[PDB]
Design a protein around this ligand. Sequence first.
Ligand code: EGY
Lengths: 60, 108, 57, 97
Amino acid sequence: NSFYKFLNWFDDRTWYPLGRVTGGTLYPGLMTTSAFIWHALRNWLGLPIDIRNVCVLFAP
Amino acid sequence: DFQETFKTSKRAYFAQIEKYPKLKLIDTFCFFLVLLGVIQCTFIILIRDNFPFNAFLAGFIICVGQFVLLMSLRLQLCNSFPGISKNRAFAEFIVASLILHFVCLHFI
Amino acid sequence: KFGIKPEIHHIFHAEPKRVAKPIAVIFVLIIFITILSLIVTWLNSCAAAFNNIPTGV
Amino acid sequence: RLTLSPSGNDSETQYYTTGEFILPDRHGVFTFLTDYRKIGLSFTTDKDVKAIRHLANDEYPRSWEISNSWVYISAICGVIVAWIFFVVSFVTTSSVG
Ligand SMILES: CCCCCCCCCCCCCC(=O)O[C@H](COC(=O)CCCCCCCCCC)COP(=O)(O)OCC[N+](C)(C)C
């Protein structure tokens, strides 16, 4: 879904009676360059690959 | 001691200003960039309140950073750096003075 | 253990205090004085002497 | 905790409403239950679990509407227009004329 729904994202599946607010508790930048590489391989270079394979082969 | 250094510095500075008509333009910009920061802090000291603290910090950052880029242009514009002309210090002043206004409009 | 139980409510927090608007009009008036003092002081002295106008091609 | 009151009714049922209440200053997951345990009568329960979000980053009173930060906006616009009148009056002048 969108990038606007990620900067302010309240998930209720962790610390259950009182869920955590993610956007003020994590460091973005490892996720958004990865969504950028996914968006560039899928639309411009022509080859669609899964998000799991972009996440595994992100360090080498 | 301090009388001699005082009158020496006044005369040796005012002759330097009256030589080049670029320097009094920089310093005339600089002094009123000091008065903006002074009365903008006087509003905070006058009524004891601290509520939109980022909107306080953004204008003050504009005053200080905009002062500093002028002093760097002045230092680089009188004496030339080895390798840098006078057409490139000005373009670097435009670009780096143009990033700072955007990141101090996002912040308020 | 099975009667009626007393109804309750919640207690919010007070909002942060705003300052009265007949001061901020005075200070934006003072800023509007100082900037025009800057433009008048540039056009007064030799600084804004428009003399290398790049007309031509 | 707050007592329900009678409302308009159809032929076989009877409707009860709570008017309007304002949700809590705290975010999290909440549950909405109205059980009716009474001796002599039957036992009825119903509940569900819903999540109450914090404020977004866009839903806030802006810097116009506060009237405490008009001073700083007026101390941004001046530096912008003074800067552009600086740059235009710098390449249209002379050196040691
Ligand atoms: C000298 C000055 C140099 C400035 C360099 C600026 C370089 C930034 C270029 C970023 C280009 C983004 C292109 C893009 O739109 O890709 C998107 C969105 O992709 C992303 O999620 C990553 C982009 C996030 C932008 C971060 C803020 C801007 C940071 C640099 C100013 C794909 O992400 P998606 O998750 O697929 O969807 C995003 C939301 N949509 C509206 C698009 C549906």
